[model samples]
Target: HMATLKVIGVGGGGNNAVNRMIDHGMNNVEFIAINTDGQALNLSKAESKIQIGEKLTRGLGAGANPEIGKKAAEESREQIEDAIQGADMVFVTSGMGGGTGTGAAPVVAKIAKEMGALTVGVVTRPFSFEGRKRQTQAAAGVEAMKAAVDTLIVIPNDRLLDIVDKSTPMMEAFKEADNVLRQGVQGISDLIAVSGEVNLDFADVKTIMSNQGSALMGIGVSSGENRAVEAAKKAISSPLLETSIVGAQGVLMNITGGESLSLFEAQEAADIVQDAADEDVNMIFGTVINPELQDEIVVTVIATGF
Candidate 1:
């Protein structure tokens, strides 16, 4: 059976990511939006709109104070619990420099793990243009998440420059980051929910992600005779991601292709993903046949324990 998957977007940036995730769509996953900001919570695209730190913030935002965000989460402890418990896997996503996400997100992960769910956190650091103070707060938030969640994935906003044309607008550039996060979540969702020739079950993901401190995810897709090779090559160097998979202790890769995808082709793609990391890196992969994909093959790579 597929494990239950719950993804919560915490604070403004997270809620926006969740909104984009909703736009991107995934299978068998519950999306929730949790925020200290009342106005933002009101606009959540996720069905479950949870407001944390009500009395503390009185439905206003966290006011850029991590302590306020932490206290707000604490004050609304039971509310958050009722929304999160009984999940098999919980993904906590946020923008690490923001008060609500940086402060409240760690607490949310703590409660999910306390109830014994696999907790994974995905966060982004501020761009250099945002200045040093926010970046400093992001470092602190990133540090705390190491102990609070099973796997922590970090992406920096500035890296968006690596892939995009200089002409791209600000929102479009930011949307690129959201697309990366969206695909990361989509990849894991497809691994368990879409069963093709090869399989990756709940336990496989549980093993790969469990207690792996820092992780990175990227997805690439292409269509045509060389789709597999090109897509595989594109994943690790995905424009939005800044890290390499070279020394990762473990890797979970999902390759989904059209009905015509050949064994040699699949092997070629899988080999590219595997060879990018160390020879000793623990690895597992699954190929799901999606008939609708036609000539396209999609590769999603999640590397952990670097």
Candidate 2:
């Protein structure tokens, strides 16, 4: 049997992000949306919608107080545990600074870890305009999550500005960030689910994540003659990485190509990634053939270290 994967969105911002992913279409995994706000939960497109702290919030909301959100998750501990049960890898996503996401996301990560699942937290820090108070709160939340999860990927919302112009609308900017995040999630899911000539399983992922501190994920897709090199270069330089790949202690690469994919091509792709990082860096690679890819090749790299 293949490894099981679960992507859970906590709170309003997280539910929105996960809903966008559901709309974009992610298969072979479970999508769960957990929230305190009834309306947001109702609107989420996830397969499962769990309302925590129903008795305390009464379906209203956490009012941006993280302590209240933490209490709610504690109250629903049994239900939360049941939701993520039996998963080999669990990804907990949320937009930090808000009450439910800041407090409950860490709690959920702890639970996933307790269940013997490799837990990864993908969270966004509030934009600068969001105020110093919110940023401080998000910082605190990050600390909590770093202590709980195996690998915590922190995506600063302000980083969106580097890709898009100032004129970009707020909603569109957020959508762009969501798009960046979807790539990371898709990469990991594909790595575990897709069979490859040289395979890297969930066990490999756990090994890298457990040993590495916070991790960064990058993805790139290209087509035609020099596709593998182009994909590798783009992925290694993706803005989503947020950190340098030069000194990464662990580098995991997944290559997906069309029916014409060859061992030589796979090795070439892996070599490109290895050359981009320090010579001593540990590298693990996998390749899968997909006819639908035609002449295209997609490369996903997860670099773990400082």
Candidate 3:
């Protein structure tokens, strides 16, 4: 039997990511978008959508106050559980440093975990220029999530822009992040979706993710020159890793390549991450074959609980 999974996209930033996934999405895993913004919920593509604290938000938006955001979730948690309850795994997606997002996502995760699902939280922190206050708030959001989620994965706006164009536009930055995050979300989804090549099922994923703390993730894609080896290099080489993935207690990654993708190339790429991780991690890796990939191969890696 296939395991059940749910992606709970919370707040404005979270909702946007879920929508991006929908525009380019899949089956098996269900998507649910939640917010304090009544209007925001209307635009979501998730078959299940929820608005928290109708009395407080009144179809308006939750502001930058995380306390208010937390209250929103606390008020409406029962309804939120309608979708969250009974899922094998629940992914809480959000954009940190915002009111509804930073505040509400942990509350959402708190519920998912209590319901007995393996809960994971994925968040994009605000840009550095967004200021000290936002970062302070983002940190609090991070802590709140750590308290609730079995695993938490973070992506910083600044670190992401460092990889792409430094002067990338505001509009484009969100899209770029959306793209990376979609792949991240789908990378996990791909793990849940695939039943071939190398064996991996719900238990395999759960074993690595079990009680793991915070995480850092990076995705690299290339079809040209030294693609396999270089892509793996790009995967582990991250500004996100304050130290080394080698220090981490657990690692979960996915390699997506075309039909022409060779077994040697796959093993080679996996080794890059494994060695960088000092081969001493609770590692769970999977390969996905996408005919659409043709030439380009995408590698996604997330290391946690360091």
Give residue 289's lDDT in candidate 2 (0 to 100): 79
Query: What lDDT, from 0 to 1, does candidate 2 have?
Result: 0.84
lDDT of each: 0.83, 0.84, 0.80
Show model 2 residue runs off by greater than 4 Å: 259-268, 291-294
lDDT of 3 by residue, 1-306 (tens): 566788888899889888877877656778998998887799899999988988887766778889888988988988998978779888888988989999999999989998888898878788898999999999999889989998887778777666567576766666766765565556666676665465566787777776878666778888876799888887777664333566766777777788988989988898888777744577787777878777898877777767
In candidate 1, the residue pairs with backbone N, CA or C atoms under 3 Å apart (3 or more residues apart, or in different chains) clash, namely: none
What's the CA error at residue 129 for candidate 1, in Å? Answer: 0.9
Write down the TM-score of every candidate: 0.92, 0.91, 0.86
Question: Order the candidates by lDDT, highest first — what do you get?
Answer: 2, 1, 3
**Best candidate (score: TM-score):** 1
Q: Give the worst 10-residue stretch by lDDT in candidate 1.
A: 235-244
* Cα lDDT tens digits for candidate 2, 176-278: 7787668867776777667787788878887778734577788878988888888888888757445667777788888888888877777778888787677
RMSD in Å for all candidates: 2.0, 2.2, 2.9
Between candidates 2 and 3, the TM-score winner: 2
Candidate order (TM-score): 1, 2, 3
Q: Give the TM-score of candidate 2.
A: 0.91
